[PDB]
Amino acid sequence: NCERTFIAIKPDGVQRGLVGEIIKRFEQKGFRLVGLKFMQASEDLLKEHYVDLKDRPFFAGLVKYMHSGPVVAMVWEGLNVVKTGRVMLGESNPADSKPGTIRGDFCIQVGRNIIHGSDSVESAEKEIGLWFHPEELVDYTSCAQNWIY
Amino acid sequence: NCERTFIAIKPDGVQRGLVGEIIKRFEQKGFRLVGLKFMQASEDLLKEHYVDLKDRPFFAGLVKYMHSGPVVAMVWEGLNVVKTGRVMLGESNPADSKPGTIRGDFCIQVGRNIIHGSDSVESAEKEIGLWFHPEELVDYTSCAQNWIY
Amino acid sequence: NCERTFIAIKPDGVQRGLVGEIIKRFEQKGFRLVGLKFMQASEDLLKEHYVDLKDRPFFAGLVKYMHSGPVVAMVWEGLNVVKTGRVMLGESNPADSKPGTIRGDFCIQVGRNIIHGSDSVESAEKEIGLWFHPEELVDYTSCAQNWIY
Amino acid sequence: NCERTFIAIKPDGVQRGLVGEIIKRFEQKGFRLVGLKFMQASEDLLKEHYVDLKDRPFFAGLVKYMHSGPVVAMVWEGLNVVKTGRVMLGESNPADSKPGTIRGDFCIQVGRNIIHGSDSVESAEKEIGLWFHPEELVDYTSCAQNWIY
Amino acid sequence: NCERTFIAIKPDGVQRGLVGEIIKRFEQKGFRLVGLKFMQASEDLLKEHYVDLKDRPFFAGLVKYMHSGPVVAMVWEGLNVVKTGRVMLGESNPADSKPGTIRGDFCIQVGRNIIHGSDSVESAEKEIGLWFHPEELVDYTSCAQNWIY
Amino acid sequence: NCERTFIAIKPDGVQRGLVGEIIKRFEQKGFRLVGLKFMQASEDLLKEHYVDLKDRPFFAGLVKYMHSGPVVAMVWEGLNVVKTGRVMLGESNPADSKPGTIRGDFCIQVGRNIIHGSDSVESAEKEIGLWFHPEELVDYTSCAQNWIY
């Protein structure tokens, strides 16, 4: 119930005016927003984040594209939030994401996926600790918690 | 073509302001609204409704929760409405409902699934007879029936 | 704060699938739904309701049109709800209602204004007592009252 | 990346005011609109289009229904547009289309499928050449192409 | 009731993906779409259209901007359609258009006002005859005319 | 064209899930998001912000309410952004805000106006300097600037 996930809206999602539509989807699903911040991602930070896929031919291109514009990084809290976030985001390859998701609604290519989300409950914490300072994680109580859980 | 289903918006979905968004989904799908009323469900009525799942550990909790606030009960009429309503509503367990449905959009927990729908064409008639009086079921002809069918 | 208004969606707005969109507008404004009921309006009831405008050339036409299909009658509760309801509904004459309202969004003619609302806090009570039985007015407490008032 | 598809909104989809909601879906997905026109389809044109399903019991009914009102015909250009358009449109049989698609959101019957789309990259070109003149196909560059691809 | 207006979505509104959101606004207001086509406006056509404002310092800039991309030209038919369309579009100067209109929602600058509309019932006919051939104007009967007028 | 405004979503609008709907409105209007951050406002910060209305009977209540939950603070950049933001937000008193604005859509009481905006181009700079560090103000170029201006 205190489980948290890390979602990052990419510069493709920022110059396409997609920040509000995704936040509304998460809020109306019912997850509690814990952290929200708007940076220009540094290359060292991106390499630390994507060391998992570093040994890929497209890693350099991914880093260069991601350090082109600003990113919207958010932390969402709730029950099964990590898995529900991937379900809502859809599959990365656009030839596989169904309509009704986020990628399946706003994505055409795989080299730009507009949105990124944590895969596991360990990667989620690793990304939150890497991106957000512990003091920038608001812990409040929503007025709809009794009507969610 | 005169098939009818029973949909009930629970107090979880009433205090979250979800009555309009579901009615729009059904109306834009194209089903004809036959009955609509707004009550506080009595415990005897709830027990008669949920006698199917009475022999479950969570039956008492379900009855106590559903007799807390007001429910929005409606009857929709159309072709294959009973099955199409379940398809639109989605699966009860939130870890199985896909985005684009109602539960997959607004639900996080199984204990409060915000919406309830008839499973079979016999349970639908049973629930309609149990909840609505036969005089509160409007039988009109929509202006778009010639195009719907 | 316990002030209540009476809104009635006409059959013209019922065959156009406008029930959900108006309910969403009221709910997202933040008023608390107290009564909701779906009937076929009887001519005697309509005459008792419109005795105010009975001495008009279009009274008979209004009654005949209103007793053609079903009406959605709702009661909304909140602060300054009667005046805010007229503000949201807009002006009756379509050549005067601004965009962003309900009539200014979905209305073209004055003979079918899709929606009707109480004018004063006395007519509101007169209409509520005339249409709804006192037992069909649910008195619950919303979870967002602390974040409305 | 220059791949093109043919989509046709049927007179049932025009009578129900569904033209804007589909165009917005395609635009927000990110495809580039190339052709758009609003006509009354002739029976010879429809027979040439549906010669594939001519040897079916419902061919005459399909042609007669389609030559009743006006059709909106559009051409969309993008990567994997032919397959992605079919995915967004959903399955023809309403008892198989999932919510979140176009048919799964606005369709109840199979005899009227509100929308029609090309199945393969060859049928797409055959339909574009059949329905549009080569001079009515705009070739511009969008301001968001650098992000989409 | 057979009154018609001319609306043109400009290339600024075409590369911003605003075609669907405006068509849906007009359709939900309830006007009947008569003509729709997607062209690249020629400079001679634009000069004939804007001869009224030809003797202005910004006429050449207006023509050069308008002949840059493709425009969407539509004809809408209804009661008081010419005046209602201007009301819905809003005022040209962005520092005067209120929220809820089209310009007041999607416009920041006067040089790119996304949309253009006929001012009077004579200019409307002058623009329709200038832009559309008489054979490209569909004259059908909508299924909701009884509930518009 | 480099004018900037300060908008703050209050905890009243944060616990009601209104963050996405406002961001969409600003983005679709066309203003460029420069800064975005999510904090719990400190009482000293609030007193420095509201020293203008400090000599009012409701100043203490305002500060106590504002330091109850988290606020969403953002900076928007564009042409006439300071005045356009107030126009979009609407009047503070709910009995004066028209539908189509933000307050006129989601506000019922003046004590909780969900949103706050800078009044003048000097107060905007004062609030930006007071709330955001100069390093947290991203200066990128959108892909739609060539069309907006």
Author numbering:
A (entry chain D), B (entry chain E), C (entry chain A), D (entry chain F), E (entry chain C), F (entry chain B): 3 to 151
Question: What's in the article?
Answer:
Nucleoside diphosphate kinase A (NME1) is a multifunctional enzyme that was found to be pyrophosphorylated on Thr94 in human cells. A major role of NME1 is the synthesis of nucleoside triphosphates, other than ATP. NME1 catalyses this process by transferring the γ-phosphoryl group from ATP to a nucleoside diphosphate (NDP) via an active-site phosphohistidine intermediate. Oligophosphorylation was critically dependent on the catalytic histidine residue His118, and cryogenic electron microscopy analysis of the modified proteins suggests an intramolecular phosphoryl transfer mechanism.
For this, purified pS94-NME1 and ppS94-NME1 were vitrified, and cryo-EM datasets were recorded and refined to final resolutions of 2.8 Å for pS94-NME1 and 3.3 Å for ppS94-NME1. Notably, additional cryo-EM density at Ser94 was observed in both cases, which corresponds to the monophosphate or pyrophosphate group. The resulting model for pS94-NME1 revealed that the phosphoryl group is directed towards the His118 side chain, with a distance of 6.6 Å between the monophosphate group and the N1 of the His118 side chain (compared with 7.6 Å in wild-type NME1). Our hypothesis that NME1 oligophosphorylation proceeds via an intramolecular mechanism is supported by the cryo-EM data for phosphorylated, pyrophosphorylated and oligophosphorylated NME1. Both the phosphorylated and pyrophosphorylated side chains are oriented towards His118, with a distance that would be compatible with an intramolecular transfer. Even when the enzyme concentration was increased, the overall activity of pT94-NME1 was approximately 100-fold decreased compared with wild-type NME1, consistent with previous reports of a T94D mutant, which may be regarded as a phosphomimetic. The activity profile of pS94-NME1 was very similar to that of pT94-NME1, reduced approximately 100-fold compared with wild-type NME1, suggesting that the pS94 mutation is a suitable substitute for pT94. To validate this hypothesis, pS94-NME1 was freshly expressed and analysed by MS/MS, indeed revealing the autocatalytic formation of a pyrophosphate group at Ser94, and the formation of oligophosphate chains at this position. By contrast, neither wild-type NME1 nor the double mutant pS94-NME1(H118F) showed any higher phosphorylation states. These observations suggest an autocatalytic phosphoryl transfer between His118 and prephosphorylated Ser94, to generate the pyro- and oligophosphorylation states. In fact, when pS94-NME1 was treated with ATP, detection of the pyrophosphorylated intermediate was difficult because it appeared to subsequently convert to the tri- and tetraphosphorylated species at a much higher rate.
